[PDB]
Amino acid sequence: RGNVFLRQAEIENPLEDPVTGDYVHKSVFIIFFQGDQLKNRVKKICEGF
Amino acid sequence: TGLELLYLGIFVAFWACMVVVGICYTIFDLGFRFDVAWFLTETSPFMWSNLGIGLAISLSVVGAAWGIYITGSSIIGGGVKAPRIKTKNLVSIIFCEAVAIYGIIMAIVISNMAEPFSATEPKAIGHRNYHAGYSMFGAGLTVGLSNLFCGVCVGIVGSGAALADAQNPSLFVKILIVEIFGSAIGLFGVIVAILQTSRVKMG
Amino acid sequence: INPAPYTVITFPFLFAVMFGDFGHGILMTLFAVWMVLRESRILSQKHENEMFSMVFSGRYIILLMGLFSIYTGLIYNDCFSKSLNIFGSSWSVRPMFTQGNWTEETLLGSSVLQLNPAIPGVFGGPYPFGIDPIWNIATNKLTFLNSFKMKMSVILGIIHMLFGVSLSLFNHIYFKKPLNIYFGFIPEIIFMSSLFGYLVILIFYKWTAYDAHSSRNAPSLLIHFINMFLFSYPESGNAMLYSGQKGIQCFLIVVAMLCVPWMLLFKPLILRHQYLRKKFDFGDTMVHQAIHTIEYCLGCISNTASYLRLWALSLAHAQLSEVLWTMVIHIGLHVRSLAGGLGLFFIFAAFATLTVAILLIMEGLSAFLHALRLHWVEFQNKFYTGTGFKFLPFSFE
Amino acid sequence: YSVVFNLVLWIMIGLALAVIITSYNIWNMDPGYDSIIYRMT
Amino acid sequence: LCCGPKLAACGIVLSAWGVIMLIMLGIFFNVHSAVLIEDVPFTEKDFENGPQNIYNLYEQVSYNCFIAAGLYLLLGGFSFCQVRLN
Amino acid sequence: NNPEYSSFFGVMGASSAMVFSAMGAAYGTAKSGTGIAAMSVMRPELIMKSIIPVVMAGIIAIYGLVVAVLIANSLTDGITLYRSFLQLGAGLSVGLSGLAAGFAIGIVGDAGVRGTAQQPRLFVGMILILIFAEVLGLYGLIVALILSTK
Amino acid sequence: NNPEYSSFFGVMGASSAMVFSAMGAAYGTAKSGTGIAAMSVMRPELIMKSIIPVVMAGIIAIYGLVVAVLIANSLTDGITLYRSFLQLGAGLSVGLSGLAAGFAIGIVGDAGVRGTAQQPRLFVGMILILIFAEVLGLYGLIVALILSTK
Amino acid sequence: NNPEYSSFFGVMGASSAMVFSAMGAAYGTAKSGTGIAAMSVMRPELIMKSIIPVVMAGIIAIYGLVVAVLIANSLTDGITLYRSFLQLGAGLSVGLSGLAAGFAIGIVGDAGVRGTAQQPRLFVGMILILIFAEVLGLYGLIVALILSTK
Amino acid sequence: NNPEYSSFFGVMGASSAMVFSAMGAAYGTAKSGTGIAAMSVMRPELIMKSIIPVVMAGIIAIYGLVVAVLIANSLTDGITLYRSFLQLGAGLSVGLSGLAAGFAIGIVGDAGVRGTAQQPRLFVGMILILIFAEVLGLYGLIVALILSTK
Amino acid sequence: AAGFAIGIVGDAGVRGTAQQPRLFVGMILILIFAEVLGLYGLIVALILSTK
Amino acid sequence: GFFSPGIWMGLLTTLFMLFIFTYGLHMILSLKTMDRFDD
Amino acid sequence: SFFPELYFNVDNGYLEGLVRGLKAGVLSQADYLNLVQCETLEDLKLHLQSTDYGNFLANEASPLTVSVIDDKLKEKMVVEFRHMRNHAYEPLASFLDFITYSYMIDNVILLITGTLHQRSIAELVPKCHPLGSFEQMEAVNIAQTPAELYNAILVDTPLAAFFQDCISEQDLDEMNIEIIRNTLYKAYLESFYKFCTLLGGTTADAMCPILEFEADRRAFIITINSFGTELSKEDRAKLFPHCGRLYPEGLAQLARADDYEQVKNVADYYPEYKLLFEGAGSNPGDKTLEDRFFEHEVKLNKLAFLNQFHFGVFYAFVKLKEQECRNIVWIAECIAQRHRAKIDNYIPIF
């Protein structure tokens, strides 16, 4: 609900897939929170991602 | 649909204008300015002839294309799991082009009898040229429309037969009966277009 | 009846009728020579171009196709859309034309066309080989070319079909099928003959009969054929082509009518009689016989009409070649004393690329496939059952 | 006058049809239905 | 090396075709003296006096064919040289 | 003398007579063929029977001929306006009657093929309905004759 | 002296009496046909009792035919244009009334034939609605005759 | 004798003769392009073969030009109405035939391009049907030519 | 003797060439643009490698503008109606051909820009497909140059 | 045309201002041009009444 | 002049062309594409 | 001169040809007759190699078990469906998305019941159908109140279009999940019926009876199975669909039922369900009612295929294909256990 903040960073070289071997792209993110219940909610979301 | 609404609006406006104009003119005792004789005597016979000539090939080609696509799409799609149907089901395409062949032959036949004249007023041209122009226009129109509807029906049944043949080999050889019965109406159209202009002596 | 021995030649012939040009034929035969002579190295070589593999499959196809293309380029007197005046013209002689009140007109010649007539006394005459070159420059060439090409196409198509049915007669006689010869081949060949061999013979009669002075009221064959179909005899409007046409024409109509019922009732009934003698769905046999007879009778007109593809594509090819000549290299010739060859080098390079791209490989493909279709349907279905198995040997890879 | 009537009539019909079509299309317009629109409450 | 053989073979056949066709067209102009059937193109808006101007102009036109042939032959030689770069 | 535009009306009538008949016959034949093709997968033994609808549609095409020929034979250079009106009326009547009958046969056949595919006892019933559609077309023919040879 | 072109209108009247009415009767069978496609697949025994809408459509066609024949028969050369307009009005009247009757008959027959599959008593209701749905054509025919004979 | 309205019809014929063919070829190329985009991802190796439908559509353009200059090589100030309408008829014929051929080429090209991606053997068959599509243009050209001389 | 209204028709050519021309250059320059956005998110490297369709659309706009400016430069007040017809025909041909070319380049670009992101090879194919549409535009120009000189 | 533009941009700005107040400024700037689409027109019409 | 002698012919021809151009435009406008992409 | 006859093929001919080609790949009755004669799973594998279901098990499955066959068959199904969807145009894409929303609802309900069984978190992933998967499928675990579920689902899954307003609560439990299921299902069915009747033509004719029967079957099931619940009769009235022919019945007779005989009396006035119930003896020695429901569904789906311009033959195809998958896996399971009690209880499709 917009009470938290986030920032993103990008990588160029593709990272290999250990199981199949296909190349896929990724990105890095950093979130600043204000509570632990939100940490658990975004932990569930990040388990989804 | 916006396009259908546009067409309906144009059509309704046109017919409302026609109705209102007709009623006020008839009530206004102005029937002497509606002289259809001038309308159908100023027009040159060659315009009627050439419109007929154009249509007699144009509409046939339109029907041929319609049937070509309608059967070809199904023929190509349905053969992925049965390549055997590529060559067995080529009769429909052959008929879809035979329609255009008939159209071209009719265009050649009617294209004759185009000797100019020198008269420039209705009293000098005479009845014969008027008859020639009207008859040629009518023949072109009828052959074109007949071959159009013929080609559409041929294409539809060709698609049906081609699609059904991929299930069992012993189907197509008997489902082609409707396919052959399709072409008879186009043949009739050609015959009538022949007969309508069998007594024109323009020149 | 194996159709390869005849097809191997009648296929490039029909192609060459569809593709009758000299230079393009020479290019095709040169490609054929290249591909034939280098066969050993290319065969022992890996190539990524599958198109080239299927091109290479048809070696002698392309060779014979190019040979007959060269021939038919020579016979039309077509060579890159221009005739080759080899051993003389016989049409235009202006010094002789001055006899027939032909002088001073060319002052108005700057804005008129001044038709040339036939036979002011020494004109006409047959060129011993091909089309007279003057026709290539005549502005009304299209009329005579259309007439000649349409007639040649129709005549070629009728003999192809009679060939088909006569070949079928061999197919049936070997298999010991007296019924098929007696109530099969005979009515169909008689129908084909009576309906179109008459047209062939009439075309040749008109060719060898009417001279130039009879240009007034020259009879028209197409209207006579419409009256052949519609049985209409107006008292006037078209003079008889030859005396006594009425009786022969009427008998032709009556035999054409009498052809159809012979193929419908007699042979299913004889099959029924044989089955009765044995002691067979009769209605299904009647349905099959009606299907066969109607198919043949309508395919008659449909195939004779579809043989016009020869004329159509030949005329289109001639028009396309002339169009290329008209607005690609025509600009290349001009008055510039120095820049002629320089610009013409670029222009002819472009001409070569464009005539390779369009008429060489493509119109050749269209004619190739059209002739293949004419072989598959109009020719093959009259003697070729088109059913059975194909060998599957036990050989490994 | 019999020519000016036709000329003005056809020009007027064309211009009227054009404005009608364009305004009609600009009315039935898809804003996108993004997180601003679809979302409510 | 430069102008690899892959296109140089096509270039060589093109140059041979150009040389042959241009030479033959020029010879057809000169030998037949530009018969109107085989030679429509020209540049003269006034010829009513006699044919000598027409013949001279058509010879002038046909002259350029051999220059074109020479350029095509030089192109073919250049392509052949590039083929030898192996 | 007569006006010079008399033959135009008869010409248009003769054209329309075959145009409309052809459109109706085409629609009926197309729908009957589609029905037969759809049905053929499940009941291969009924293929002959379901051809009865399509041939029915074909008959309407023939009706068109019986009008369009008859006008073209009776047309000449200087006919009067009365006969031209008569021929136009006959042609339009038969053409549109044939069109409507064609639509009727098409719909009825498309349904009846399915009915006989799923239920044999249906078949003969639907045959009756098809005849009724044909009746309408024939009525058109009658009117045209009374408006043609008169 | 009555003009000659006046006859044209009269001829067109006959055309309507066989065109418009016919189209109505087309619907009057066609929809009913697809209704049967849903009825007899589970309840075939009632097929013989389900022909009534088709007979009503045939009756509409009969009305159209009788009025068209009557209009065409009375036609002559020397007509006052008032007679021609009277005939045109009668023909248009009967044609459009028959169109309405055919539409109503078709829809009612379709609804009733689909509905009878779960009510054995729907027969009387279908008949008693159908009488009203068909009386329209009779009224149009009555007035068409009273106009034409006058 | 001939009014100033004459060359109107010939000029419009010349314009339309090419405009319609251009539109048809454009639609064919568009449909084939989207079909190629769909086909590409799984089977790249066929790309240089699947150009065959596209070039085919392009043919139509050239055909229009064969007439679009030709009629333009005969127009002059002193031309009668007869020749003008002859030019008009030729132009309409070629233009509409080109339009129809373009539609057909586009559709069958898309279908075959999609088909070959999962069955290479289909390739041959595709080209065969496409031949017919090209012929649709060819006939439309031919008549136009013989309408420019007579 | 020349009618006053004659110049009108030529003036409309001065509009028409441009009027449809820009429309084609609004069909493509927009649509292909969306394509180059759809994968600037993921593979921004190919942003400038498939912008060709937009440049071509600009080129068809130039094709229209050339004929427009020549049309305007060949203007007068006592123009004979024949030259007026020629001028309007040239304008119409160029305008409509340009509209079609713009359509084709636009849709093909919107497809190919998306196709290139799944495999690189498709790029080569599109350098042909797009150019084929461009050929149509060039063709229009040629006919205009015959209608402004003969 | 100007009325239409104001209507659509007003819908956009109205539903966008519910999220964050900083969309108050930018949208109104758009609105200025969306009204100028009308203003221009008035000017020329006055000239057509001046003569 | 009711309308004129000639513009009747002109209008007939131009309307006839207009119908065909509308045929062309209906199918040129209502072409369709694909969504997303095959893997 | 109507929609399906003259421009159906331009955007659908190839895909319809492919679907009708793949229809023949469905196993036939003789295939069942010979497949029920296997001795071990390897024989089943081989007899599938001999037919169109061959060359999909080339893995190193030495310890072959029926779960592997189930997984591979489902994988084949999703592959063919994704193929059919990706090559489609836009109205057909709307149709196929409308189809897949059902499995998406199924996955949503599965994860909602999984949240109650907190002990399992990741294991739910292999249990969910990949056909009904979407971008935010696994996020459903986050919610603990139905308003939070609407917040999660409003985001980018169009499933919210069926319950954005239709759910009003703030106390998720294990009893209201059935209410969520029924509300979502009835909303989806109503939207699908409305869209199908908006499309018009033969598509409406083909898809109206099927959804009608689907709504009526849901009504019958919910009426029978609602016994012994905290819900009141008015709430049972609230959940009935209005797309069937039971629209007056939904409040008139079913909404006041008290026993099974009353439901039978409701069914008695419609032959289609009356024969279905009479044939469903529900005895230990006879098939249950669910079996007759499945058989009637199969029969109607098989009927649905026969239509040349069927814009929605994909519904029948996917339902039949799921049913073949179920038949095959069930027969394999019976064979693996070395018993022949219920081998001859397979519904005979094609």
Author numbering:
A (entry chain a): 192 to 240
B (entry chain b): 3 to 204, 206
C (entry chain a): 389 to 667, 712 to 829
D (entry chain p): 601 to 641
E (entry chain f): 5 to 90
F (entry chain o), G (entry chain n), H (entry chain g), I (entry chain h): 6 to 155
J (entry chain j): 105 to 155
K (entry chain c): 413 to 451
Sentences from the paper on this structure:
The synaptic vesicle V-ATPase is an ATP-dependent proton pump that establishes the proton gradient across the synaptic vesicle, which in turn drives the uptake of neurotransmitters. V-ATPases consist of an integral membrane V0 domain (also referred to as Vo) that functions as the proton pump and a cytosolic V1 domain (also referred to as V1) that catalyses ATP hydrolysis. The V1 domain comprises three pairs of subunits responsible for ATP binding and hydrolysis, and its activity is coupled to the rotation of a central stalk in the V0 domain, mediating the translocation of protons across the membrane. The V1 domain reversibly disassembles from the V0 domain in a luminal pH-dependent manner.
To further confirm the identity of the binding partner, we used synaptophysin-knockout (Syp−/−) mice, and purified the Syp−/− ISVs following the same protocol as for wild-type mice. As anticipated, essentially no SYP1 was detected in the Syp−/− ISVs as determined by western blot. Finally, the binding partner density was absent in the Syp−/− ISV SPA maps for both intact and V0-only V-ATPase assemblies, validating the identity of the binding partner density as synaptophysin. Synaptoporin shares function and primary sequence similarities with synaptophysin, and it is present at a slightly higher level in Syp−/− ISVs, potentially to compensate for the loss of synaptophysin function. However, it is improbable that it interacts quantitatively with the V-ATPase as there is no density for it in the Syp−/− ISV SPA maps. The absence of an interaction probably arises owing to primary sequence differences between synaptophysin and synaptoporin at and near the V-ATPase–synaptophysin interface, suggesting the specificity of this interaction. At the current resolution, we do not observe substantial differences in maps and models between the V-ATPases in wild-type and Syp−/− ISVs. SPA maps of Syp−/− ISVs validated the V-ATPase–synaptophysin interaction and demonstrated the specificity of this interaction for synaptophysin, but not for the paralogues synaptoporin and synaptogyrin. We observed both intact and V0-only V-ATPase assemblies, consistent with the notion that V-ATPases reversibly dissociate the V1 domain upon acidification of the synaptic vesicle. For Syp−/− ISVs, there is a 2.1-fold increase in the average copy number of intact V-ATPase assemblies and a 1.7-fold increase in the average copy number of V0-only assemblies.
